[PDB]
Amino acid sequence: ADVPAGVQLADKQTLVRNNGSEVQSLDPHKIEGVPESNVSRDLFEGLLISDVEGHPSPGVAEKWENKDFKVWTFHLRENAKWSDGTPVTAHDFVYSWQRLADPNTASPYASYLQYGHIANIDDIIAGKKPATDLGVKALDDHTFEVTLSEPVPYFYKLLVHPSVSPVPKSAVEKFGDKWTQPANIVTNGAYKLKNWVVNERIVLERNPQYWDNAKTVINQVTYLPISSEVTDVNRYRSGEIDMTYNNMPIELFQKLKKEIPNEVRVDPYLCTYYYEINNQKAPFNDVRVRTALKLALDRDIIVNKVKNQGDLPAYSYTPPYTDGAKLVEPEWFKWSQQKRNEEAKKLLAEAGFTADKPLTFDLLYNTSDLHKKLAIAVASIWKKNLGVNVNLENQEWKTFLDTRHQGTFDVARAGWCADYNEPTSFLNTMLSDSSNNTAHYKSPAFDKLIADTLKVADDTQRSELYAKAEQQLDKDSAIVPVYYYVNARLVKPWVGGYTGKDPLDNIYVKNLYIIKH
Amino acid sequence: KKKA
Numbered sequence: 001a002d003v004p005a006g007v008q009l010a011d012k013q014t015l016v017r018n019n020g021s022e023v024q025s026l027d028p029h030k031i032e033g034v035p036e037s038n039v040s041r042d043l044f045e046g047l048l049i050s051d052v053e054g055h056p057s058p059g060v061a062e063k064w065e066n067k068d069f070k071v072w073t074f075h076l077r078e079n080a081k082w083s084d085g086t087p088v089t090a091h092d093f094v095y096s097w098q099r100l101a102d103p104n105t106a107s108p109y110a111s112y113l114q115y116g117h118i119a120n121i122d123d124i125i126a127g128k129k130p131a132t133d134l135g136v137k138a139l140d141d142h143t144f145e146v147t148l149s150e151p152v153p154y155f156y157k158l159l160v161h162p163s164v165s166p167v168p169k170s171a172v173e174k175f176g177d178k179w180t181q182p183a184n185i186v187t188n189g190a191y192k193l194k195n196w197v198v199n200e201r202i203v204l205e206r207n208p209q210y211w212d213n214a215k216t217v218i219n220q221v222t223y224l225p226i227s228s229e230v231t232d233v234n235r236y237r238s239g240e241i242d243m244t245y246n247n248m249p250i251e252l253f254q255k256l257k258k259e260i261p262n263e264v265r266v267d268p269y270l271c272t273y274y275y276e277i278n279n280q281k282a283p284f285n286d287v288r289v290r291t292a293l294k295l296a297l298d299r300d301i302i303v304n305k306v307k308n309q310g311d312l313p314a315y316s317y318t319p320p321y322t323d324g325a326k327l328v329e330p331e332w333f334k335w336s337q338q339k340r341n342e343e344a345k346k347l348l349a350e351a352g353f354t355a356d357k358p359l360t361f362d363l364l365y366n367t368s369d370l371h372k373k374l375a376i377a378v379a380s381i382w383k384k385n386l387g388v389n390v391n392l393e394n395q396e397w398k399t400f401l402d403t404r405h406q407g408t409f410d411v412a413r414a415g416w417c418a419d420y421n422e423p424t425s426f427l428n429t430m431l432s433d434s435s436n437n438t439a440h441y442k443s444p445a446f447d448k449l450i451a452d453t454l455k456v457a458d459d460t461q462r463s464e465l466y467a468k469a470e471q472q473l474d475k476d477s478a479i480v481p482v483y484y485y486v487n488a489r490l491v492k493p494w495v496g497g498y499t500g501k502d503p504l505d506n507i508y509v510k511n512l513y514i515i516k517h
Numbered sequence: 518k519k520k521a
């Protein structure tokens with residue numbers, strides 16, 4: 001944290017944050033969500049971290065260089081240490097990235113090494129070559145060298161993500177899956193795990209061995225797993241929660257803006273809300289069926305007359321404000337709803353869905369007030385504009401992720417946030433073989449468009465290829481885009497250090513501080 | 518990352 005001159009700091013430096021739900025795990029190679037990443041950034045640190053405005057900055061690596069965007073060399077700081085006092089070395093990174101690539105780890109982010117194009121990743125993922133073949137090497141204890149199969153100019157932007165953080169081999173190898181219990185875990189971030197009570201709380205305390213420990217101000221931070229946005233708000237305003245999760249209740253939002261406007265933080269966020277269609281499950285494997293759902297959805301009612309929290313109606317997957325996105329707006333987005341409905345009714349009828357035989361399916365969402373209210377309004381618009389019957393089903397977070405990876409769903413509420421600010425952070429998730437592809441979308445035409453972006457050394461053709469890739473997804477109606485998020489949350493007036501400037505919202509509790517109040 |  002960088003405390004301004006003249007700020008008076010409270011005597012007790014502790015913070016309570018709501019985190020939306022119970023995390024799927026504390027192991028960085030086993031996580032895929034925002035709740036999981038919020039806690040991971042405070043425990044495990046990788047080569048680069050984000051500064052308070054979101055820019056990629058030095059983490060364990062003090063400096064780095066590249067040769068042709070293909071060979072990247074990271075010089076690790078000599079005082080980086082684990083919480084048990086042992087040093088963080090280049091060998092930790094070699095071990096960790098081979099463990100992430102290893103099919104046996106079954107990481108939901110296995111494909112993040114493909115996004116980066118580390119040499120040999122495809123064969124390692126496919127079981128053809130051992131993980132030890134990965135293109136990474138420790139030249140010495142403090143120099144980590146990475147070799148790509150192609151020039152990737154934005155490569156270092158990826159490195160702030162939890163998946164490429166280091167894991168302590170000795171604990172992983174001694175305790176297996178219980179290496180993350182408070183008694184066994186070893187961490188290299190600003191905090192260490194003090195307590196973990198499933199469905200109650202996660203308590204972290206400062207890690208004294210952290211190399212930048214002298215700038216850490218908060219000594220203890222608690223993460224709560226409350227998935228009810230109304231409860232998060234009540235407990236914030238009663239004084240128990242200092243920072244809500246960034247899901248706001250439709251029930252109270254307008255009233256909070258009126259009553260505690262200074263506490264309501266609303267900033268740009270690179271995330272898209274959408275309904276994920278299982279592309280492999282009949283009748284969703286029919287493009288007319290997906291296109292009808294996409295068209296009959298009235299975004300103006302949902303975004304502006306139902307949620308009304310500042311989001312923008314979406315027509316694409318990648319948010320249009322992502323760095324390097326130059327998207328073309330589809331013409332159906334330009335039509336009236338009336339024309340969209342007529343066309344939707346027409347396509348559904350071509351697929352064999354009459355009034356005598358309505359299309360019926362389930363809409364799965366992760367337990368939440370906000371997602372339930374939105375699913376009820378959407379089930380209702382689809383009923384009214386298309387005559388389809390929708391069954392709403394809620395699942396707790398970690399189970400809901402599981403269901404989607406397995407493909408046992410029809411339609412699911414979804415929301416992807418960027419891991420790095422470049423259009424492939426979104427587009428790579430739709431690759432046929434991506435481990436993050438829960439749409440189960442497989443398109444060789446889409447896959448080839450993304451492959452070509454790294455075969456050109458021109459940012460205008462790359463952008464033109466990203467816009468054609470969004471157009472291919474749109475043509476296939478792989479998903480139903482709803483809105484581009486605004487990051488809305490409540491932050492007590494005594495929480496300093498949160499600018500709201502990072503569009504990826506990569507918050508580190510080590511940068512925050514409590515003002516005396 | 519998947520946003521809950």
Ligand code: IUM
Nearest residue numbers: 153154457458459
């Ligand atoms: O690395 U350039 O356009």
Ligand code: IUM
Nearest residue numbers: 152153154458459
């Ligand atoms: O530093 U440039 O494209």
Ligand code: IUM
Nearest residue numbers: 154323324421422
């Ligand atoms: O900030 U730029 O590509």
Ligand code: IUM
Nearest residue numbers: 360361362409410
């Ligand atoms: O409608 U059903 O799985």
Ligand code: IUM
Nearest residue numbers: 230251369372373
């Ligand atoms: O608080 U209510 O659905």
